[PDB]
Design a protein around this ligand. Sequence first.
Ligand code: NA
Ligand code: NA
Ligand code: NA
Ligand code: NA
Lengths: 167, 171, 174, 175, 171, 171
Amino acid sequence: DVPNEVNVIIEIPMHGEPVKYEVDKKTGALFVDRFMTTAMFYPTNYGYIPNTLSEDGDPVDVLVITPVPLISGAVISCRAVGMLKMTDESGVDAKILAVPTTKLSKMYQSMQTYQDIPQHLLLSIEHFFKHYKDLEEGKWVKVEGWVGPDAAREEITSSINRYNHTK
Amino acid sequence: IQSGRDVPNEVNVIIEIPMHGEPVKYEVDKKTGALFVDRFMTTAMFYPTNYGYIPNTLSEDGDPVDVLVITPVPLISGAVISCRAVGMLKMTDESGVDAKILAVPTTKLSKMYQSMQTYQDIPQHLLLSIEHFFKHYKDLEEGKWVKVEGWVGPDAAREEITSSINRYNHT
Amino acid sequence: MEIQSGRDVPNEVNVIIEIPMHGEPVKYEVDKKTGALFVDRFMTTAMFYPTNYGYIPNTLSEDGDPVDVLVITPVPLISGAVISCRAVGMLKMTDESGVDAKILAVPTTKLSKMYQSMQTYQDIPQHLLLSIEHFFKHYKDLEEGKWVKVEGWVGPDAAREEITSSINRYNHTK
Amino acid sequence: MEIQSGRDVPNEVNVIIEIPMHGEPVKYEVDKKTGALFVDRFMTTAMFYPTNYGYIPNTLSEDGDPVDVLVITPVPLISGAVISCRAVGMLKMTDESGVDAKILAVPTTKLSKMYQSMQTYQDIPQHLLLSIEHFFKHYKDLEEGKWVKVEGWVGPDAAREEITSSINRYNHTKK
Amino acid sequence: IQSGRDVPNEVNVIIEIPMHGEPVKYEVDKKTGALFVDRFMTTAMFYPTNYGYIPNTLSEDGDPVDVLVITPVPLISGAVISCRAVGMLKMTDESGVDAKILAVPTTKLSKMYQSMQTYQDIPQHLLLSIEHFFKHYKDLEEGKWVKVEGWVGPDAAREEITSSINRYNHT
Amino acid sequence: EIQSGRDVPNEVNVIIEIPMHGEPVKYEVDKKTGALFVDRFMTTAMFYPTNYGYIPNTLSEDGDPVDVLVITPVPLISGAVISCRAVGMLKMTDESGVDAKILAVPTTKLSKMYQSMQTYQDIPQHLLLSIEHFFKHYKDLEEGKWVKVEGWVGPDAAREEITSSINRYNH
Ligand code: NA
Ligand code: NA
Ligand code: NA
Ligand code: NA
């Protein structure tokens, strides 16, 4: 039920080890991209929507909120509530924020837009992505800010399209 | 993945949920082989054993044979373990019958289970906690219920495995 | 322990944690005489506490035990920790030994502002209320001769009355 | 601390846990004088205690140390917890300082019925007995000037005799 | 519990927060010795070392001297460890000056740290993550803030231990 | 489907079977099916002091791929792939013949903290000794097995082992 419901493959569990795992899109294997150099942890699970492409050639990133951590390699059906827009040394870096669908858990039903998310969590997600790469030489992050679920769903749709034209 | 070295005496089990794990109900998508989140558990319970299935089996409900595998320390989701059945827990729920095989690792994996031949050899506290878990872990899932009928022995368990492997080949 | 009942009883109370949320199936209890953390028993169901679990020091309920408190936190606390919290309600039960009330509390706003909008148990996410109720109904199912009947939830006013009466009971015995 | 050595010594004794089973390679020890949990050393081999590890308060071995106890439990305990247990045997050993016997104990029946049939160390699964002996044989292999000589297992009566003798030594230091 | 065997060269540190632990900011009540929850972490950060204080010291701010203790694996809250200062991270926060000692276990506890004599001997990635942690762990605490000044050597660290131990004796 | 490495034999990909400091479960990838099987449960109370895995598309003399110990700052998970480079090799003999295990660190892209690690002598001595001690002893209670440690050799011999085994695999 794209773009309202999407499958996300988890790469990094919430509150996990400072290991930045990434799926190799060619082989489907979970590679270690790098070790984290700040003493920070992902406040949500982190993964991507398969068969998406976006402008920079990588799939659409998704932060998935769950009551307990997921494992790397798991797939979870979720729906977007907003998107954190950012710029870094490489250009734009949007990251969608999503909650599990109601079939997986009814506890997120009232979460429709990013302002519905507990404010403390929005702030720590923002802070994490502003700062987790601070000690990586040659990198910087600027937070443009949050946009709503329509823009998030717009980001999903365009990136699904970009992937379709390529293949 | 072969069903086992010496079916139905020794079988391979693919682990979906580790013992004492997070309240996340993972399931292998049989079509794609991917580990999906089916739902989050709504009771404060954990699986007292590892939980998985025998590949290339077709029980009556159209799903593979479920197996509880006792191990000394937790396994991880996605692992395959060779084991042998010591009994089977027979249940009914809203969809019909729901049997769960109980198994221990084969002697090659560990000599410590060698004296466990039947479910009656398993420590009573663990048998009771397994029954209680499957009786109650879905208590807060709307429209569901569980009735525990009781345990049957390894011969009965092996019959269930054999019957279900045959069903998979024809279907 | 030389710990006090709270910074502003019964609105803010100190709770000594015995069992962490999502912890090992070990039923630890503080020996009220010596202050040592003892293993009372191992749990016999495959269950875990959905919140942290402890007691208010210097309180005396009717049964001779301190007031029990369930403390919600964003991540688990450790056994032996003390946390300042405030009651939002109380789960009333009866068991084979008589009455068994347990207060539900959240950290004070000084400790964490994220709970400031939690004023009554009805503000707590419903799935957690149901999992707490289910845990206490069932965690002792395999303990011979024990049973639990859940009467229901009562509000912050009733919880504070239970605290105050039990603080009063303790002072009289001193 | 004011924790007593046991309700029905030597049949049931209180054990203060210093190191959890399968825990971090940190060798904690209670300062018997102050009751504080100190770091004695870090493990230098990649080994973990196959049981919980602690001691009986108010006991003194022939060399002046409290009686050490290995406590078997279904899940790990935490450092600093107290558990009532009963001895099923004792692994006799010596180290670079003298005697270093370790009692092996299971929770009392009040704490768990699952150990009721464990009466002697030979009732304990052989793999655990061997992993325990192997652990103490080797965990100090990389500590220069430290070693262990394993002298063998004895039954519950010998273990209870050591508890009683050790309680007597402790009382004699107050007498 | 004394300040240490040979102050200021070897000191006892009581651990309040483990390395890589839960985002719970525990603090010992210096009056009673009880481990209280001071607050929860509001950024997604964890302490890159263990964190605690030296008993029987009186810093300028009225609290004991804080110490960051490097260990190969995490310690637990409430444990005491004999250690020695290799340097000090100088900072100021909302309450004033706030130096934190960096220490390693003494050679009796672990010989792996014997060649660590100054903070410059500590791996650079760890020095940087420590600096980054204290720069940012109060970013979402309204009315709390930190400015990180820089590192000073073991002698200056020992000067601080001695200065703060002196105040405790007269007071 | 994973290749042997970006720049063999200087940089190789390693598939992790057993994480550092993990459960005493001896996982192994089935080279035929690619599935992670439980080979056995460990019978000593020991843990791998590094992560443990193998280089895909290699064949050593014993018919198994080249085994690699991978040092990381925090544990990896079973099934992860890590780009690394050899700094030495632990040579042993057992009941089955020769048993070399290469020691590797992450490449500089993954972590700059190992850049100065060029040979096994660069590795902290305590870790080298604990690795040696682990492989000498973790199979002590496995019947019919024994280990003799011949010793460590340098990165050139390690790469020679890698290079020959890549050829042997192609051949
Ligand atoms: Na079934
Ligand atoms: Na030695
Ligand atoms: Na040592
Ligand atoms: Na601030």
